[PDB]
Amino acid sequence: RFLKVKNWETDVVLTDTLHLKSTLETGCTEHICMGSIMLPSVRTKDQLFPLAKEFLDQYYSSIKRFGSKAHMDRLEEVNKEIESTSTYQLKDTELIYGAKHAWRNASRCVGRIQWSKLQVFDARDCTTAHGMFNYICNHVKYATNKGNLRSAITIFPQRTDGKHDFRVWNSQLIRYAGYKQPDGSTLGDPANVQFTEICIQQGWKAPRGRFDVLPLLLQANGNDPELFQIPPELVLEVPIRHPKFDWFKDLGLKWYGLPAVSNMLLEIGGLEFSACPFSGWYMGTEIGVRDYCDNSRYNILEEVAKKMDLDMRKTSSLWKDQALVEINIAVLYSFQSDKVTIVDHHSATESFIKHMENEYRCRGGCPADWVWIVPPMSGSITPVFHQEMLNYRLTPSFEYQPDPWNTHVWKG
Amino acid sequence: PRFLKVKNWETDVVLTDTLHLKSTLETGCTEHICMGSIMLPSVRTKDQLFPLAKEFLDQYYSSIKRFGSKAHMDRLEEVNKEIESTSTYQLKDTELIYGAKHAWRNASRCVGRIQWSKLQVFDARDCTTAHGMFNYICNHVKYATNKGNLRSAITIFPQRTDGKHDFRVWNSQLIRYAGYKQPDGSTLGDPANVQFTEICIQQGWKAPRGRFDVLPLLLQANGNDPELFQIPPELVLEVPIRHPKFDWFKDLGLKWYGLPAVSNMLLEIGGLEFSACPFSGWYMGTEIGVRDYCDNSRYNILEEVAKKMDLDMRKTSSLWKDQALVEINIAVLYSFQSDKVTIVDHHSATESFIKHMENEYRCRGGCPADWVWIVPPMSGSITPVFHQEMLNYRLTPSFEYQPDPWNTHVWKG
Ligand code: HEM
Ligand code: HEM
Ligand SMILES: C[C@H](O)[C@H](O)[C@H]1CNc2nc(N)[nH]c(=O)c2N1
Ligand SMILES: C[C@H](O)[C@H](O)[C@H]1CNc2nc(N)[nH]c(=O)c2N1
Ligand SMILES: N=C(NO)NCCC[C@H](N)C(=O)O
Ligand SMILES: N=C(NO)NCCC[C@H](N)C(=O)O
Ligand SMILES: [Zn+2]
Numbered sequence: 001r002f003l004k005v006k007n008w009e010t011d012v013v014l015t016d017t018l019h020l021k022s023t024l025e026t027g028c029t030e031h032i033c034m035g036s037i038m039l040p041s042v043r044t045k046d047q048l049f050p051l052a053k054e055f056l057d058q059y060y061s062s063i064k065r066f067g068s069k070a071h072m073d074r075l076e077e078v079n080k081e082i083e084s085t086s087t088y089q090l091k092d093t094e095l096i097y098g099a100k101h102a103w104r105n106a107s108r109c110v111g112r113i114q115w116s117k118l119q120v121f122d123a124r125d126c127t128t129a130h131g132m133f134n135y136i137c138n139h140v141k142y143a144t145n146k147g148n149l150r151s152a153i154t155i156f157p158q159r160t161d162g163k164h165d166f167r168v169w170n171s172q173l174i175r176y177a178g179y180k181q182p183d184g185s186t187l188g189d190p191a192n193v194q195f196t197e198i199c200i201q202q203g204w205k206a207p208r209g210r211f212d213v214l215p216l217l218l219q220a221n222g223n224d225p226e227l228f229q230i231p232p233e234l235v236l237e238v239p240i241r242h243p244k245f246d247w248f249k250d251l252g253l254k255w256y257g258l259p260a261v262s263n264m265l266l267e268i269g270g271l272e273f274s275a276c277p278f279s280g281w282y283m284g285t286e287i288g289v290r291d292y293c294d295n296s297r298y299n300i301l302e303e304v305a306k307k308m309d310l311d312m313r314k315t316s317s318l319w320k321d322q323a324l325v326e327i328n329i330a331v332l333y334s335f336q337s338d339k340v341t342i343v344d345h346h347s348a349t350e351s352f353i354k355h356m357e358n359e360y361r362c363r364g365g366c367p368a369d370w371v372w373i374v375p376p377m378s379g380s381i382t383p384v385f386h387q388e389m390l391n392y393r394l395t396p397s398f399e400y401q402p403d404p405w406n407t408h409v410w411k412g
Numbered sequence: 413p414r415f416l417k418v419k420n421w422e423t424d425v426v427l428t429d430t431l432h433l434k435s436t437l438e439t440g441c442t443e444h445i446c447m448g449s450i451m452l453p454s455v456r457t458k459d460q461l462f463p464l465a466k467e468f469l470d471q472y473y474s475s476i477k478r479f480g481s482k483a484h485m486d487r488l489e490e491v492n493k494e495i496e497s498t499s500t501y502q503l504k505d506t507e508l509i510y511g512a513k514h515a516w517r518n519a520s521r522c523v524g525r526i527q528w529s530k531l532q533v534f535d536a537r538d539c540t541t542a543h544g545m546f547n548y549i550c551n552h553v554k555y556a557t558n559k560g561n562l563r564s565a566i567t568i569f570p571q572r573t574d575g576k577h578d579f580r581v582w583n584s585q586l587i588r589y590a591g592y593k594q595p596d597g598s599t600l601g602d603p604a605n606v607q608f609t610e611i612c613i614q615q616g617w618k619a620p621r622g623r624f625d626v627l628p629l630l631l632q633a634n635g636n637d638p639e640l641f642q643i644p645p646e647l648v649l650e651v652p653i654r655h656p657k658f659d660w661f662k663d664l665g666l667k668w669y670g671l672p673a674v675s676n677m678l679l680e681i682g683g684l685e686f687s688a689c690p691f692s693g694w695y696m697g698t699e700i701g702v703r704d705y706c707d708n709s710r711y712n713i714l715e716e717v718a719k720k721m722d723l724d725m726r727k728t729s730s731l732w733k734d735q736a737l738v739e740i741n742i743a744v745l746y747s748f749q750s751d752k753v754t755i756v757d758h759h760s761a762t763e764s765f766i767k768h769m770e771n772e773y774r775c776r777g778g779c780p781a782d783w784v785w786i787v788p789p790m791s792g793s794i795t796p797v798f799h800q801e802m803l804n805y806r807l808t809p810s811f812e813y814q815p816d817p818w819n820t821h822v823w824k825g
Contacts, residue, residue, distance in 0.1 A: 028441040033804040035448025036783035315759035346728035370449035380789030391446040
């Protein structure tokens with residue numbers, strides 16, 4: 001019930017008490033660990049007040065006014081409001097604190113050393129999809145910042161009766177399209193094939209290239225979603241070259257500078273924010289290892305290996321591994337040279353370790369999902385590989401949610 | 413949850429696990445905490461032993477298609493009387509073989525399990541002394557090494573009785589290199605074995621004090637104080653490490669042993685506890701080239717290799733570490749293959765494991781696996797295992813951790 005975590009390179013041991021404040025289930029039971037499962041599985045008035053109270057208590061505790069008249073007044077006010085209006089509204093301060101802490105609590109995010117510097121854009125006054133498009137352009141421009149990226153979240157109106165949800169249908173603000181071809185193959189990004197079909201279905205005139213920035217498909221107030229194209233001038237892209245291989249540029253590879261997860265649900269004080277796109281900056285392996293080398297993504301390893309002239313007749317030459325490293329040298333070098341913020345996995349993981357220690361010291365723990373935190377290349381040469389971690393759910397939190405095309409009731 | 417789906421995210425293959433229902437002990441996980449990445453998480457009375465014996469013999473008799481037979485029922489009766497009467501019981505030879513193979517089959521951290529049915533079991537339960545253990549252990553090493561054509565094997569010494577007569581191999585592996593902490597605070601040899609090296613020296617080992625000294629065996633029989641033995645050098649197969657392109661690599665002075673033989677685990681079969689049960693297969697290359705060589709707390713050669721490669725070591729963003737890691741691993745696989753010592757690369761190993769795993773779902777209803785351990789410590793997502801959801805749970809028979817015996821041993825003098 002007070003749990004210890006050990007680092008096996010440094011022999012440092014930290015003691016976790018924060019996990020006792022953990023709310024929802026993990027997936028795992030006593031007889032079965034589901035640690036490697038990616039997805040392991042509206043609120044009534046009575047459901048909402050304990051949640052609201054739980055949140056408000058931590059808010060007022062953070063500003064050193066726990067048990068104050070200010071605290072008791074707010075709790076009563078919110079209580080009155082849920083009783084009468086079946087939901088409630090957060091003050092701006094509570095929204096900002098909640099969104100920062102959702103990030104602070106995000107156990108799969110290696111970038112949390114930065115958690116308190118989040119720029120929060122309150123888009124709760126938004127009513128239409130054009131409003132949504134304007135908010136998002138402003139977010140994209142604020143966050144990109146000419147290549148000197150800055151973290152931000154834009155929060156649209158909270159779910160009410162579940163029939164007036166705001167959603168961004170995209171999985172990220174900026175992603176490339178995918179097209180299934182007549183020769184069975186895939187052009188562009190296979191991750192996005194379905195969402196691209198939905199765009200075309202809804203009107204999008206697809207260019208049918210490899211790196212087509214997808215349009216935004218935005219749903220306001222439960223209405224049917226509408227398409228909008230992000231101003232091209234707002235989408236910073238980086239062309240991929242290698243400092244030593246002149247032929248690399250001829251692979252014709254680019255990637256975008258701004259990672260902006262847009263399909264998650266932000267839960268604060270029981271309230272549910274279904275449209276809450278957020279952005280930081282890339283760790284290099286995200287692009288070089290996963291986006292480029294997953295067999296089900298752009299799957300370029302063989303192409304690169306061939307051009308490096310590696311011995312590909314046997315796995316034990318480690319040609320896959322040699323290519324992977326060079327692909328990742330190229331990503332990093334390309335971003336650095338264009339002056340676009342990017343972090344390498346060594347620097348990223350060392351910062352997370354420093355953050356874990358800070359968090360253990362000042363908060364009594366840090367929920368972390370080892371499976372996600374350890375990079376997909378060179379695991380054991382990063383310090384996080386050697387670090388025991390405890391994954392648990394704290395609120396406020398970011399949550400996965402059903403893709404909306406599986407759920408939406410098309411009015412037409 | 414009589415049915416649990418796991419998905420592969422590359423192929424969309426979904427497999428259904430029913431085997432977890434037969435899961436015995438626990439994981440250290442509760443409903444509100446996942447300790448997936450914790451390395452060591454949280455004598456038997458008659459009461460406790462007969463169900464464990466029954467459970468196991470039901471499994472054994474079921475596997476040989478004689479469940480419920482007179483032979484099955486007679487054996488249950490015979491074991492039951494033996495426990496009641498003597499407090500323990502003895503496994504038949506066939507049952508011990510079945511048990512040992514099944515502990516391997518069930519070992520959730522082992523990527524080598526496609527081979528589980530081919531284990532050579534050496535029955536050492538007639539052993540009474542440490543010199544006896546040394547002889548058995550020598551025979552295991554020679555059989556398993558097989559001049560470089562490695563064969564999986566396990567040697568099983570007598571089981572625990574009262575906890576005061578345990579057989580233990582104090583070595584963590586049968587073959588490992590000594591580590592020596594210097595006065596200036598550096599380490600010569602393998603830092604993982606400093607404590608054990610010190611114990612050996614205390615017991616009378618004359619340490620050559622080099623970087624790659626094969627440790628002596630420290631063997632406890634029947635609860636007695638352990639005794640030292642040198643494994644005959646002729647039986648210890650080693651491989652000097654060189655690179656197919658970099659001729660300066662050999663001058664790093666690197667070598668490694670060919671036989672990985674874990675000697676400090678406990679084998680549980682039918683409730684019985686076998687505290688000395690060394691086993692050996694063959695290396696996956698990343699064990700040596702990523703962990704043994706490049707862990708900071710091991711030989712830590714990454715810098716020296718990168719300097720000699722003249723990589724840009726000013727900025728981690730050159731990925732010099734990653735570049736060196738790969739060349740070192742090329743060198744390990746090259747060196748073993750050239751000398752004809754069995755070794756498997758992490759692509760082949762992981763591809764084979766996914767096949768093994770799918771086959772186990774279909775024929776067994778499951779395959780417990782620990783993703784944290786199965787995914788290799790380099791190039792993770794370019795191996796198929798990374799993309800595979802895995803369920804970790806404990807089946808018996810099993811291999812278990814046990815405390816180091818210097819921590820528990822009652823010295824006779
Ligand atoms: C500022 C620099 C940031 C860095 C370097 C970073 C890094 C990462 C990485 C590498 C992942 C794993 C991504 C993947 O494998 O797809 C991740 C996941 C995640 N991050 Fe961050 N991140 C940053 C900013 C943020 C921000 C601003 C938020 C929220 C406000 C956030 C919340 C999350 C969440 C909820 C996940 C899980 C995503 C999922 O399950 O798909 N991160 N982060
Ligand atoms: C035959 C070829 C084999 C291969 C390629 C193989 C591969 C591996 C690897 C790479 C590990 C991780 C080791 C580490 O990180 O230290 C491992 C762990 C393990 N293996 Fe195997 N293995 C083989 C044979 C065996 C045998 C014969 C047994 C038992 C009879 C076995 C049982 C285990 C167990 C219990 C672990 C976990 C060890 C621990 O917890 O420290 N393996 N295996
Ligand atoms: C803390 C973490 O569990 C630890 O470093 C684990 C990671 N995964 C592992 N995987 C293998 N195969 N061997 C190990 O020693 C480790 N150690
Ligand atoms: C099956 C396994 O959960 C899956 O492939 C996970 C592994 N760890 C991950 N880690 C990160 N950061 N991102 C991912 O998408 C994955 N996917
Ligand atoms: N660093 C971040 N967020 O700030 N990553 C978000 C997920 C991005 C996704 N992994 C990609 O490679 O496109
Ligand atoms: N492949 C096996 N056994 O067959 N490994 C046993 C553990 C060896 C340990 N990882 C080492 O690098 O020495
Ligand atoms: Zn778990």
